[PDB]
């Protein structure tokens, strides 16, 4: 099949506006010495650590 007619501006924009992305949320690193933003349930790219303030564990050597 082929598009019979050129789609109107209103309809084209109605469909196109739904092509979008949500913002990445980010969470503050539990390490007091780092305090950076990292993905939830993900090792902090700055400190390379994971876990709560108390039981922190190194994950990435960075």
């Amino acid at each position: 099949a082929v598009p019979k007619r050129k789609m109107s501006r209103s309809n084209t924009r109605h469909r196109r506006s739904q092509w979008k992305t949500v913002a990445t949320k980010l969470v503050t690193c539990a390490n007091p010495a780092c305090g950076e933003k990292h993905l939830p349930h993900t090792a902090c790219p700055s400190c390379g650590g994971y876990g709560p303030r108390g039981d922190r564990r190194q994950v990435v050597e960075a």
Binding site: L39, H41, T42, A43, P45, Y50, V59, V60
Partner: protein
Amino acid sequence: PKPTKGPRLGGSPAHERIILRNLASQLFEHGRVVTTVTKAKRVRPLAEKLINRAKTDTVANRRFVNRTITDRGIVHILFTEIGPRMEGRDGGYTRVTRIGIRKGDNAPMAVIEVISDKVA
């Protein structure tokens, strides 16, 4: 252990078997490995089965582990270092932690690593 339900890694179940076995071998070789989320979570059960089998050291057990792995050096590592490291552990010999994503293809990446500290 349990099969993978969905489509297999590497475009073929035989290749998935090869991938999982090599990935477990590399995990045992290096202690830790960054291997994306799905591969790590699929290799975890096999790796823990192998570690549990290696927790008790007999010639028959070493041959059974060598059925997998197939690198006797890695078999020696598993039966000498990893095995005795888990004398008191009742399972859970490995852990997986997410790292981020790959820029090239947005693969969610994670590191799977054998437990290092002694339970006692």
